[PDB]
Amino acid sequence: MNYQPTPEDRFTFGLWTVGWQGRDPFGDATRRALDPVESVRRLAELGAHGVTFHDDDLIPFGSSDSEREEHVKRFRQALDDTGMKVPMATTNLFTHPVFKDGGFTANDRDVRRYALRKTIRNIDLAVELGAETYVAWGGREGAESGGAKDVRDALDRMKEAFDLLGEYVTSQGYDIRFAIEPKPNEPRGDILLPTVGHALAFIERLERPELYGVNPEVGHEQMAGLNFPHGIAQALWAGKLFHIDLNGQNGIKYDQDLRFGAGDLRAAFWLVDLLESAGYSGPRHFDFKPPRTEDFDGVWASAAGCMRNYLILKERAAAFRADPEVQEALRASRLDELARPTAADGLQALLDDRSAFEEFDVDAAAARGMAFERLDQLAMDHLLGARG
Amino acid sequence: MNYQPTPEDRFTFGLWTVGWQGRDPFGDATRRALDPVESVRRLAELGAHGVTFHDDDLIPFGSSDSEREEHVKRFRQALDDTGMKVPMATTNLFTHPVFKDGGFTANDRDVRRYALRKTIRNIDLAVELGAETYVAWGGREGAESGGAKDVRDALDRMKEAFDLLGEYVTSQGYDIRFAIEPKPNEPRGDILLPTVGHALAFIERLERPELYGVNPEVGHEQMAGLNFPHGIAQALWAGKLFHIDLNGQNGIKYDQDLRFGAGDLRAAFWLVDLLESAGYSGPRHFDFKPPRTEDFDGVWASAAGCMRNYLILKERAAAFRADPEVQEALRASRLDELARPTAADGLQALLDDRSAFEEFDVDAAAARGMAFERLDQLAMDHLLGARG
Amino acid sequence: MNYQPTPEDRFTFGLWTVGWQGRDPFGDATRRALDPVESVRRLAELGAHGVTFHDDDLIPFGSSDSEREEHVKRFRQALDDTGMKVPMATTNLFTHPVFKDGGFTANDRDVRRYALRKTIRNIDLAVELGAETYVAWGGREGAESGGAKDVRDALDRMKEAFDLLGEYVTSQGYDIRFAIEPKPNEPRGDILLPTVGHALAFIERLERPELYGVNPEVGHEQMAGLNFPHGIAQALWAGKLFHIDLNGQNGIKYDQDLRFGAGDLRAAFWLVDLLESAGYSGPRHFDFKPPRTEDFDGVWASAAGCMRNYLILKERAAAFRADPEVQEALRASRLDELARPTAADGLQALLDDRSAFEEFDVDAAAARGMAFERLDQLAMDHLLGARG
Amino acid sequence: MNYQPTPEDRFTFGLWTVGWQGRDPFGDATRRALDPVESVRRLAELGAHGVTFHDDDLIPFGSSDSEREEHVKRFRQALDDTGMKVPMATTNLFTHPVFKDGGFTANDRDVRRYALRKTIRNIDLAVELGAETYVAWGGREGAESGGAKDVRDALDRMKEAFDLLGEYVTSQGYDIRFAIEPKPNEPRGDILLPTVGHALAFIERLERPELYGVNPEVGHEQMAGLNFPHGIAQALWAGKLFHIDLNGQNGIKYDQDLRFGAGDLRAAFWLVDLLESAGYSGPRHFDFKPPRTEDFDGVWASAAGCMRNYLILKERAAAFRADPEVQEALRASRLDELARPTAADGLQALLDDRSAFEEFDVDAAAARGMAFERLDQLAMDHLLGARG
Numbered sequence A, B, C, D: 001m002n003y004q005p006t007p008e009d010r011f012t013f014g015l016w017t018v019g020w021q022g023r024d025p026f027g028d029a030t031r032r033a034l035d036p037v038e039s040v041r042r043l044a045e046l047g048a049h050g051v052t053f054h055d056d057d058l059i060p061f062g063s064s065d066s067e068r069e070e071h072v073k074r075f076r077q078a079l080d081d082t083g084m085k086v087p088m089a090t091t092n093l094f095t096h097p098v099f100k101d102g103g104f105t106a107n108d109r110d111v112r113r114y115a116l117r118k119t120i121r122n123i124d125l126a127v128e129l130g131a132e133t134y135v136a137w138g139g140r141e142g143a144e145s146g147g148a149k150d151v152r153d154a155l156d157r158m159k160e161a162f163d164l165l166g167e168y169v170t171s172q173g174y175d176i177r178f179a180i181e182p183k184p185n186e187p188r189g190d191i192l193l194p195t196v197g198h199a200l201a202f203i204e205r206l207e208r209p210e211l212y213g214v215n216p217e218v219g220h221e222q223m224a225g226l227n228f229p230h231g232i233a234q235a236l237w238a239g240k241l242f243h244i245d246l247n248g249q250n251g252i253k254y255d256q257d258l259r260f261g262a263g264d265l266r267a268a269f270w271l272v273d274l275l276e277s278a279g280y281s282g283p284r285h286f287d288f289k290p291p292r293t294e295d296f297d298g299v300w301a302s303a304a305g306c307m308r309n310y311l312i313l314k315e316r317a318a319a320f321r322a323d324p325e326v327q328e329a330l331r332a333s334r335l336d337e338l339a340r341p342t343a344a345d346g347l348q349a350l351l352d353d354r355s356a357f358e359e360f361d362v363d364a365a366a367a368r369g370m371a372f373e374r375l376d377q378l379a380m381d382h383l384l385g386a387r388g
């Protein structure tokens, strides 16, 4: 009867989300800066379980070692005061002008070494605060023109960078894993590892692949027109969904970062159905921006709506899967047969089975309808609460 | 002075390309059927090196074992008469109604076993004709609605199918490799393994990954808005570019299959630059459709233009790379530094190098321009033959 | 409690929708042909109010004047037997090979005159059957390459064609209006008048603009990434929404023609909200294709779902607009002020009003939040039936 | 032999283009601010004919009437010193936070009146500096959510605003025309009047339509996947191409504003062919951003490349149109017949012409190939300078 989140639902938010001041490529900030302590207190009141940060969200760029310890202490006290956790952290390798051609794959070698040292410094801080996952979004790794970047050499440099970070955490004995966040474009014309598939493929060429997974974001795969629940299914199949970023996006255009549930609502439904069915147990993290039309009351309304929409879709997807009429429709569409092996009898038995070829009635099999439209209308009725 | 192809340039064409009759989702065929023998003779006259086929392009669906041997004999004689080769073949698992929900990942198990037997039958034929690469385009593997396909079970079935094909070729002792061709959508609403990245990631979960690579197509990655030369660089980096399909596409829309060089011309330039620099030695295969506005004279003009445009872009990309002014611009943009290791001194030396962090002048590094616009204008002048 | 359509809800379907046999650019038909009489009877049973047709759906291309009258008589009897109406008709100027470069803007002049005579013949038939609206979808008017079509001359030819059709209906005294249906691409690489805006602009250059409006289709504007409710608002503002085609589309890709409510569900909600608020009184027509995975039971399930989803969204949008909490939120976001004139006092009073510039406090106005996220979450809760 | 621009080629640049400091939604400025006087001097040296400005590029927001006259005087002296002209100006109604929900269609009425007074103030300045065209880009007119903006009321407000500006210029006796610049999205989720077609249609509902035309931008129509030369042909057909913005864009994604010739090169070729054939006589204006990777040497290289690429494509398009082989191909594809009226004999003669229907041989007409692929390959060879 109530869709109230509790810290048990594992909802987490980046400091940079509710703290986004509203600067966009065509306009100035519409909101004042939020102190991270205040964000932690407000998020805790709304039912969130934790927060995440980039190094530069928490410690302003340039800070002295003492200003640093000052910023971390106040933050740690807010966490102690509220019971909030820090499950993930990441590095900002995109805002400062030095990173204009990238951090790990910048053409200048000195910038690449600086990017690695800035990252390692924040991994130590993240472990101290108890984060389990370290995200890497290579927002400036890419190009606007074809001759500017030899991509084979850049992938060599990207591999070199992640291999060194894995050597570092293993040498330190840290129990933290890495999660690469793909994005196809923006702010570079084309970004390297642009989709979940490219990131999963890259990981298999790292020296210690078991330390790396993906942190897919709803809106980013949708900027390439792709089906986000399908890509998450492939990540889960691979054993590599270490974290996830939830938000909304209306199609192929600039990265909108709308609140979760906005954008493609049916994709949100099928995503929640998959995460809850698959038993995904990581944080439900929102990487969203409250629109710059909003004042601070609207920021908190937008953040609350992220959690509300997850909990309504969870309820609808659970009602869908529990409906006996839906279970019968699933059998009518042969989802049960999809889960059976094609040829557990083995290759030789397949080759010798005349019912598989010589005496297969293809015209009868072809005439069988798949009954998918009835099934999808049951899913629609459940999403809209119209059953029925 | 002449851009004349020769069989030494390794240009190949599918039978289904020049033989496309012009049927589209809104209209009837505009051209009569071409006998494959006639296509081989005409392509050989134009300078092509070989042809490829789906089983059903060569042997009409349903054929008796004797009609079959008849079709193959006439084909083989045309190949002997012209010196044409058959470097690749593939299976049609998409046209017949029985495949309406897929071949390898159809929900019905009997259809999946039939799809495997139809494939194995054509692998034997392909080896007999000397093909080295067997392509698989899973055009019907996918869905229009979210409940119709559990994607983890479908990937299990896809893996099962490719693992069985690998067992078959290894048991037979055949020296043929497989190449998976991705496509993001069309004819299904979403197709499984939608991009080169998803296909490369999937391959690493097969039992014998070394037998499988990718067959990327220009237009398919562009249907997801992605940079095709970048994806080919990732395929080459992985050692998995076993074959390639060349054509043109104007952006994100239905699969156009225009002749190579049409569509995104600068991407075609950077693709040729990469393939020729990387020493790609496989066939240059065109998967294109002469527009249905054309008669048979226009079909052959369109096919010739595919080869012509490759050879002009090859010449322009070679002139670009050989230009001393371009080599100096490449150094000015630090492409030479991109190819150097970031930290061949190792992790501990990086950690101890104060020039990498404590005493790194970030403001000086940030002020350095990358000079990429001058470089790209040199590439433009070379493409347009305007140097200059 | 029930979402049962009745003929009073004005739902209409094209013969070609439920009768689509399932042929797509990569596969053969999966369903047998439906006799139009049978479609009329089945649709009437499901609660539809009427059907629409292209000339060639009803009378096979080539028919003799006697076979023609035979086909029309049986059709008319089915309409009499069921109470079904025919509110719209249209011409097929896209399937036959003669139309491969267009009907009204074909480069060959003889084909353009033939296209006009084929159209005029069907306008007479449409009036006889009582249609009020004649739709024109110029699916083959366009090009795959830049030199093939001079677009200024083609627009002259398009204007010439519609001007002649208007002269014909006015001379005959027919009370029928024309509705142009835009589409951005497919089957041509680019189609002329690709969006609702281009079609409305073109109409204003016709000799008798009052006889012409638009027939926008959900999926077509979404193939250009555009907001369909916004474009319909512009069509309504102009007084030109003469008819509408309802269906679903998942983003920028081939024309899917899914059932209404599939695709972008929130856009469907805002569309129904607008049509019902604006008092649109024309037919609610579905231009959709039941997926080729389906047998005939699935065709009728898909058609019923079109009507069901309209009626559920109508109920949710009406509950949204009637909710006092939503009416207060609308005032909080100043929708009431949007409807007031900016300067009904006139230009001189605006120029003399120092509160509009010299003494306007821009910092105070800037700080006012628009409260749009709270409003949108109320709209989401109403759509999901989660209030709340 | 040289592609040197001269002020006679009418190339113009906005102050905000070469002066863009490099701030993007994910990063800080990489370049220092340019004094507009310095931009005018540098552009004049490169061969430009003039500059354009938004009010806030020239006079910083908030300026006192005296600081204002100071900024304008220095600017005017730079123009006198260099011979540079100011053919266009525009208003910034998008950067300041007060415009976060729009200027002319903001929900708050006080902001709409302020937007009008800010605009009128700059129209006076523009006339003083001799501009002939006043551009309006409604970058903040739009919405991220469906309930935030009733689009019919917003179009009423947009019409009200432009009608008042037309009353103002006519009352003042100014000889200046307005040009509306469409864009489909960014920075709002959807922007009103998103394409050239929507803008042309809107203009026909203004009180004095002859004072308004369009200022289309290459990259903006390409953000909707549309064919930019086609839309410009429709604008020219309507008599409404008052100005144009040239730049490059790689497909459907964020607004890149690359230099002209980058992005879709063949579209750039067909655009130049059309503008030069049609005798477009307005400024060739570049709205581009030098990438933030560049230092000031790269800014000027990028600006020069805009002009260079126009002049090379002009030469190639002129060589194409002058080639006798191309003129014969144009006749072979019946472009000459496209330009002839379909039915100058009139409606009754068409109806009575049995060669148009009863005795039209449709099978013979259908078999005629259009020869478009040969023509397009001639256009490709001319673009690449490969003739041939």
Ligand SMILES: OC[C@@]1(O)OC[C@H](O)[C@@H]1O
Pocket (backbone or CB within 6 Å): A014, A016, A090, A135, A136, A137, A181, A217, A245, A287
């Ligand atoms: O940096 C990690 C991330 O998820 O946080 C915001 C940034 O844009 C990226 O999407």
Ligand SMILES: OC[C@@]1(O)OC[C@H](O)[C@@H]1O
Pocket (backbone or CB within 6 Å): B014, B016, B090, B135, B136, B137, B181, B217, B245, B287
């Ligand atoms: O089947 C292999 C392939 O490359 O050939 C044509 C088909 O559409 C696919 O693109």
Ligand SMILES: OC[C@@]1(O)OC[C@H](O)[C@@H]1O
Pocket (backbone or CB within 6 Å): C014, C016, C090, C135, C136, C137, C181, C217, C245, C287
């Ligand atoms: O011809 C009118 C129309 O609405 O019916 C189907 C066709 O594709 C078009 O969309």
Ligand SMILES: OC[C@@]1(O)OC[C@H](O)[C@@H]1O
Pocket (backbone or CB within 6 Å): D014, D016, D090, D135, D136, D137, D181, D217, D245, D287
């Ligand atoms: O404001 C007019 C314009 O052309 O200049 C830049 C702005 O983004 C817009 O594109």
